[PDB]
Amino acid sequence: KRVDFCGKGYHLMSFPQSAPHGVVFLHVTYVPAQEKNFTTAPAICHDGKAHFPREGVFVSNGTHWFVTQRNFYEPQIITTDNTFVSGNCDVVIGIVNNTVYDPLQPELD
Amino acid sequence: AGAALQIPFAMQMAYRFNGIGVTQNVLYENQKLIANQFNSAIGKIQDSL
Ligand SMILES: *[C@@H]1O[C@H](CO)[C@@H](O[C@@H]2O[C@H](CO)[C@@H](O)[C@H](O)[C@H]2NC(C)=O)[C@H](O)[C@H]1NC(C)=O
Ligand SMILES: *[C@@H]1O[C@H](CO)[C@@H](O[C@@H]2O[C@H](CO)[C@@H](O)[C@H](O)[C@H]2NC(C)=O)[C@H](O)[C@H]1NC(C)=O
Ligand SMILES: *[C@@H]1O[C@H](CO)[C@@H](O[C@@H]2O[C@H](CO)[C@@H](O)[C@H](O)[C@H]2NC(C)=O)[C@H](O)[C@H]1NC(C)=O
Ligand SMILES: *[C@@H]1O[C@H](CO)[C@@H](O[C@@H]2O[C@H](CO)[C@@H](O)[C@H](O)[C@H]2NC(C)=O)[C@H](O)[C@H]1NC(C)=O
Ligand SMILES: *[C@@H]1O[C@H](CO)[C@@H](O)[C@H](O)[C@H]1NC(C)=O
């Protein structure tokens, strides 16, 4: 996890080869590509409660809000298993209104 | 690690709080105090210099 100790990018793995009086390291790394821009927010307010992502960021495609993982764009809908709650929505700078979906009660019809 | 991708600075500070074991609500609920403390700490360096 040391930055630039094993090449440029996120180190995946490395292979050694012998040279005359030396060694050659072939570093395999992961390099992110083809980014898009989005709107973002730190928390989400629902029922007077602030919701934070467990892992990921809240992003908006223009009209809807999703959670994604931070390094590869893979959007999902914001549920109570995606997030955790802390406090009320009066203290966070930049909080946004949206609905956080519960699975249990629409299972219970 | 590649191309520069923008992110707002308080959200970068929250990632970094996660990287030491503190949840990020602890940053967002203290943002103003944390920024005051950083500013006083930076203002103390030029005084010693
Ligand atoms: C943002 O993504 C959503 C996808 O959830 C698009 O909204 C539509 O949402 C309904 C119900 O959620 C789906 O049945 C549709 O298939 C979605 N797409 C369309 C084209 O109707 C929404 O269009 C996206 N917004 C932008 C600006 O890209
Ligand atoms: C990001 O910065 C913009 C300014 O560029 C902020 O927008 C202003 O919001 C205030 C309310 O606090 C309004 O009174 C101003 O009229 C807005 N200005 C513009 C140019 O839109 C925005 O609130 C900031 N975002 C956050 C999360 O603080
Ligand atoms: C997000 O939703 C909340 C919940 O209603 C909004 O809070 C209201 O804000 C208006 C204007 O600031 C007040 O007149 C109401 O009294 C508030 N309602 C409650 C129940 O407190 C909040 O304004 C919404 N945020 C945005 C940006 O529209
Ligand atoms: C955590 O520590 C900080 C000290 O940096 C406290 O904030 C200070 O509190 C004193 C009260 O004695 C104020 O006079 C200062 O102005 C505060 N500093 C800043 C930068 O706001 C804070 O109260 C402490 N929190 C708790 C829960 O004890
Ligand atoms: C994102 O938008 C900015 C302008 O706000 C633009 O300069 C940048 O090239 C865009 N990047 C992508 C991936 O769309």
Side-chain angles (χ1 to χ4, degrees), chain A:
Chain A
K1 311 283 128 43
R2 299 174 58 183
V3 173
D4 288 328
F5 190 59
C6 299
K8 226 260 209 57
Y10 303 112
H11 183 236
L12 291 172
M13 66 207 313
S14 293
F15 304 117
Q17 302 277 87
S18 50
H21 285 311
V23 66
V24 174
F25 288 112
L26 310 182
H27 307 309
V28 185
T29 65
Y30 174 110
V31 183
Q34 303 183 23
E35 73 272 4
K36 313 311 167 206
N37 27 38
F38 301 100
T39 313
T40 199
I44 272 152
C45 169
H46 183 63
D47 296 350
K49 303 136 110 186
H51 301 257
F52 302 87
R54 262 174 208 173
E55 320 89 16
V57 251
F58 299 128
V59 290
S60 176
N61 78 347
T63 39
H64 300 89
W65 284 92
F66 308 94
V67 229
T68 180
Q69 38 169 121
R70 313 172 170 163
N71 294 123
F72 184 85
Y73 181 59
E74 190 183 90
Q76 327 205 136
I77 85 107
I78 308 174
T79 77
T80 49
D81 315 80
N82 270 336
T83 55
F84 68 96
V85 170
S86 171
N88 67 324
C89 23
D90 278 286
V91 188
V92 183
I93 296 168
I95 193 145
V96 151
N97 276 328
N98 206 71
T99 167
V100 177
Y101 164 78
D102 207 320
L104 195 126
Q105 78 109 9
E107 177 270 356
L108 287 179
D109 301 78

Side-chain angles (χ1 to χ4, degrees), chain B residues 2-48:
Chain B
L5 318 159
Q6 78 264 4
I7 185 186
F9 186 80
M11 293 184 60
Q12 194 209 299
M13 221 51 213
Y15 286 15
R16 283 177 194 274
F17 269 49
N18 271 156
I20 66 173
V22 191
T23 67
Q24 56 187 17
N25 76 93
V26 182
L27 182 135
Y28 290 124
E29 288 148 1
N30 293 294
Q31 195 173 328
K32 283 172 180 307
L33 160 88
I34 290 163
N36 290 340
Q37 270 165 174
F38 169 80
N39 289 336
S40 325
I42 271 300
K44 273 195 300 272
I45 268 148
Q46 75 186 272
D47 275 328
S48 146

